[PDB]
């Protein structure tokens, strides 16, 4: 009965973790931020509309200069735009048109993309020949590649549908580290501001915090009733927010090791596709399947406002590094810049 | 007003726009088919007939019509995370082996392959992303099914079967049960064809069914339907 005794030991350890979490929960987040002023009403207008994609847009990512942004759509084209002038800087044809994620490097020299081909492609932007070339293809995942984020020009972290994350050295195309522990398909990841830790949300309704160097799972966070489609870190790095299919967003804290806040409304039954924070972290922006985006007071869980400008599902959204604008990309083949 | 480099950047952007519009038109003129079915149900034979890890993507051209066909059988991940990517396909080609009417699943004991293919067909046909999409159903291995139907009756799979062990009655029964798994009879049509060994009547059947689907789509666009 070696199998059963370890199951009882696992249940005992889960009981110990739950009791230790209940011990350190003297107050709630709502009880402390009950005295701060509400943010009012947030009315953001569509400043720019980026047109050109002919199919559903599945991902976008801002450059670190806050002016250039790559967008991935399933027409088989990565477009790199200039947000200020709505000019197309680059159009990159993809070998596989079934793309689900895109990333733009912090140096600005590379973009990445991947999807149902189980391959993360790294494209060089600053080439002597004047075009955009495939610099690297990273293969080794056995499921669809759902998210990718650059650490620097040589390292990238990918999440996949084979329930595993991976840290890759780009110049040798090898998986330096493999992160395992999730039992369902990992749908998103997010890097900390120091890029020492990253969080990942999977289809087992759980989020795992991972050390990048030592390759281990530090903490596991539960609470969601369905698949965690999106995840995003708090700007200090001590908290993250998850968007799931049970129509709720949740704010977890790494140091208290439990859920701090739930963002939900009875009007909203559709699942969340994307989450992000504002530069101060006061606003939490979430894209939904009801074709809209909601802006939540992240300290008070009130709906501060609505971004309503898309005719189909808001599939992706991002906030610039200076916090000047929010880009929303959607299944109706348009991106919109809001401020 | 713009500077010289701004004007040249706008001109580069408009050249990119024209290349995007041409590639979009060329993509629009092609036919996209999603290939589904149980493992070892004759999908590979279908791919070999049409041609003459990750997502396999097969191109062919028939009677000046281009076809992309997407095989997603190697995806072991959960289907509802990525099936919405195929929302705008022209048709779904679903392969069902008839000879599996008596073969138990090798992964799960005491579960039949034919019931598993009926459950997969019921999941796909009634999926919320494929309400209007039509299904071309291929019943493969009909000669092996005719060999098996003489010794092994259909009653071990369908106990409510009231017909005889002849080929045509049993094949019609399996076809009727697959077509009555269609809940949305009005919005979509199901086309059913039996396997042909080197006759090449399957590329022709796909061509005819896709032409019918394109005619119905044009009738819906023009407001007549």
């Amino acid at each position, epitope marked *: 009965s070696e199998l059963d005794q370890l199951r009882q030991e696992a249940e005992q350890l889960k009981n110990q973790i739950r009791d230790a979490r209940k011990a350190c929960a003297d107050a709630t987040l709502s009880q402390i931020t009950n005295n701060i002023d509400p943010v009012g009403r947030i009315q953001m207008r569509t400043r720019r509309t980026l047109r050109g994609h002919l199919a559903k847009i599945y991902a976008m990512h801002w450059g670190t200069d806050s002016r250039l942004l790559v967008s991935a759509s399933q027409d088989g084209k990565l477009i790199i735009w200039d947000s200020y002038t709505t000019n197309k*800087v680059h159009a990159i044809p993809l070998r596989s048109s079934w793309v689900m994620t895109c990333a733009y490097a912090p140096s600005g020299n590379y973009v990445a993309c991947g999807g149902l081909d189980n391959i993360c492609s790294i494209y060089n932007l600053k080439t*002597r020949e*004047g*075009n955009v070339r495939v610099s690297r293809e990273l293969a080794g995942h056995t499921g669809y590649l759902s998210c990718c984020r650059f650490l620097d020009d040589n390292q990238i972290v990918t999440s996949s549908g084979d329930t595993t994350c991976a840290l890759w050295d780009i110049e040798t195309g090898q998986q330096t580290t493999t992160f395992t522990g999730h039992t369902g398909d990992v749908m998103s990841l997010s890097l900390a501001p120091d890029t020492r830790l990253f969080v990942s949300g999977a289809c087992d309704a759980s989020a795992k915090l991972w050390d990048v160097r030592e390759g281990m799972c530090r903490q596991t966070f539960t609470g969601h009733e369905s698949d965690i489609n999106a995840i995003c870190f708090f700007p200090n790095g001590n908290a993250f927010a998850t968007g799931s299919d049970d129509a709720t967003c949740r704010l977890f804290d790494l140091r208290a090791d439990q859920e701090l806040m739930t963002y939900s409304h009875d009007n909203i039954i559709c699942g969340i596709t994307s989450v992000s924070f504002s530069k101060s972290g006061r606003l939490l922006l979430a894209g939904y399947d009801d074709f809209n985006c909601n802006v939540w007071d992240a300290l008070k869980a009130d709906r501060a406002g609505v971004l309503a400008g898309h005719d189909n599902r808001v599939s992706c959204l991002g906030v610039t590094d200076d916090g000047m604008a929010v880009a929303t990309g959607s299944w109706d083949s348009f991106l919109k810049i809001w401020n | 007003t713009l*500077s*010289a480099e701004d004007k040249a*950047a706008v001109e580069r952007s408009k050249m990119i726009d024209r290349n995007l519009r041409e590639d979009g038109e060329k993509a629009a003129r092609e036919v996209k088919l999603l290939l589904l079915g149980a493992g070892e149900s004759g999908k590979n034979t279908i791919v070999k007939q049409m041609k003459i890890t990750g997502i396999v993507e097969t191109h062919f051209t028939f009677k000046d019509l281009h076809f992309k066909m997407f095989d997603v059988g190697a995806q072991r991940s959960e289907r509802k995370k990525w099936i919405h990517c195929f929302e705008g396909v022209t048709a779904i080609i679903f392969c069902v082996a008839l000879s599996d009417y008596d073969l138990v699943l090798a992964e799960d004991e005491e579960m039949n392959r034919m019931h598993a293919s009926m459950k997969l067909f019921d999941s796909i046909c009634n999926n919320k992303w494929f309400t209007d999409t039509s299904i071309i159903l291929f019943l493969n291995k009909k000669d092996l099914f005719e060999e098996k139907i003489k010794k092994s009756p259909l009653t071990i799979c369908y106990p409510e079967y009231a017909g005889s062990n002849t080929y045509e009655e049993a094949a019609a029964y399996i076809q009727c049960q697959f077509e009555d798994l269609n809940k949305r009879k009005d919005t979509k049509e199901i086309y059913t064809h039996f396997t042909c060994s080197t006759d090449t009547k399957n590329v022709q059947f796909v061509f005819d069914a896709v032409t019918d689907v394109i005619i119905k789509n044009n009738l819906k666009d023009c407001g007549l339907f």
Partner: single-chain antibody
Amino acid sequence: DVQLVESGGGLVQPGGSRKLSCSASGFAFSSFGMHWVRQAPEKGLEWVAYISSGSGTIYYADTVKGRFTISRDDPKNTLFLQMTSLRSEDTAMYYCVRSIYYYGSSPFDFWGQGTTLTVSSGSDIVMTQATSSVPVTPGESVSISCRSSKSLLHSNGNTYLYWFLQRPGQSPQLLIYRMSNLASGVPDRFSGSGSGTAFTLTISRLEAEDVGVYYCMQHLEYPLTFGAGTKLELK
């Protein structure tokens, strides 16, 4: 590697015609706009013509307007300058220069070797390089000054001033693009500081391969105009 090779020069009787060609290899030629820039032998660089990528925009200098015709053939990767009614002033060495234009790009980054053409016998921005020659020794910082008649700072925040170096016997090489940005392959000791109409190029810790003629060019408005050039020499 990137290569532009010019051909078609020689000796032409005045009033005649000639056709220069520039063959491109090693880069995506149809995505670059191309320029012809001449250099009369004693004098400095002078912009001649420009054809955009996709041939949608063509510009000429006023002293070659109506006589010269620039064209490109993109499947053969070739640039043509058909020159008629050749005068004595047309005698010069001609360079094809590639330049691509998007956000953050570096125009004028590669220059061809040039072909020699010998002919026997008002609102333009004026760039002024006041000092023609400067004597310098290695290891010493040096400043090169350029002055523009019009403010080169646009309303979008860009200042359109370019710095080129021509080593003796070689084609010009891009050093600084858009006043403060340094070019690919250029050492970090070069720096560019400008305030609207006055510009400075600083060379800290000068080496033996820094001698030659330094040109400032504006790219705010067509026609593109160069400075007269400031020469650095040893001792």
